[PDB]
Design a protein around this ligand. Sequence first.
Ligand SMILES: Nc1ncnc2c1ncn2[C@@H]1O[C@H](COP(=O)(O)OP(=O)(O)OC[C@H]2O[C@H](OP(=O)(O)O)[C@H](O)[C@@H]2O)[C@@H](O)[C@H]1O
Ligand SMILES: OC[C@@H](O)[C@@H](O)[C@H](O)[C@@H](O)CO
Ligand SMILES: OC[C@@H](O)[C@@H](O)[C@H](O)[C@@H](O)CO
Length: 206
Amino acid sequence: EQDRNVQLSKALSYALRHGALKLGLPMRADGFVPLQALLQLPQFHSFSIEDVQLVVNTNEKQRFTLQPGEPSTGLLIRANQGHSLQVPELELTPLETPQALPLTLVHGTFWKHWPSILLKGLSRQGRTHIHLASGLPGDPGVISGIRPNCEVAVFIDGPLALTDGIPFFCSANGVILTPGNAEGFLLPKYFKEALQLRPTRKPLSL
Ligand SMILES: Nc1ncnc2c1ncn2[C@@H]1O[C@H](COP(=O)(O)OP(=O)(O)OC[C@H]2O[C@H](OP(=O)(O)O)[C@H](O)[C@@H]2O)[C@@H](O)[C@H]1O
Ligand SMILES: OC[C@@H](O)[C@@H](O)[C@H](O)[C@@H](O)CO
Ligand SMILES: OC[C@@H](O)[C@@H](O)[C@H](O)[C@@H](O)CO
């Protein structure tokens, strides 16, 4: 069962973040798709509505929102962040002042990307938003937004980037998102500090 819930969660992630258009799903600009249309895709034929409710209600990163739609349509489901698809109307809380930012704003990543990040800044890469978290893995209130196996973390100067015009958003599961600048980048001008997390915690020079 724990396999099937994980498997459903990964199939939901893929379809709702990346695959909807390739799959023929009628997904809205806000990232919602009728659950009934999704459950009629062959890869979902083994899952029930109760199965989907359970994965939505219990997945630790709160990846999904499930809500009632129009009378004819039934339940709607979306991924709360992480899209490569264009979902410009996805419901996000704008974070427009220093006060609305979390005190800690950090991106976890890996040695493989570290030289390129120091050179060009953080890039949204294949996704709509650079993903940031309000703490390191394990910290209070951090349910998503930073991978648990990260080797390095770069802390972001939220207020600086705000002054320079970079917009930030908070997703429903608490991920801080920024589209970056015009080219999809959070330039190194905004790197407050850096920290090695693996194998041990050690400071790192920017
Ligand atoms: N200039 C640059 N050059 C080279 N590499 C660069 C770079 N700039 C950044 N990178 C790195 O390019 C990779 C893209 O990788 P990704 O698209 O998966 O982004 P991410 O790792 O943040 O993951 C998103 C959420 O996904 C998970 O959530 P879930 O479990 O899926 O629900 C977590 O919550 C996560 O917050 C990352 O390593 C970047 O560090
Ligand atoms: O995206 C799959 C994830 O790895 C999974 O662990 C879910 O959090 C959980 O299985 C659903 O309840
Ligand atoms: O369809 C796009 C492709 O799947 C990739 O760009 C995603 O942005 C993401 O990186 C998937 O993990």
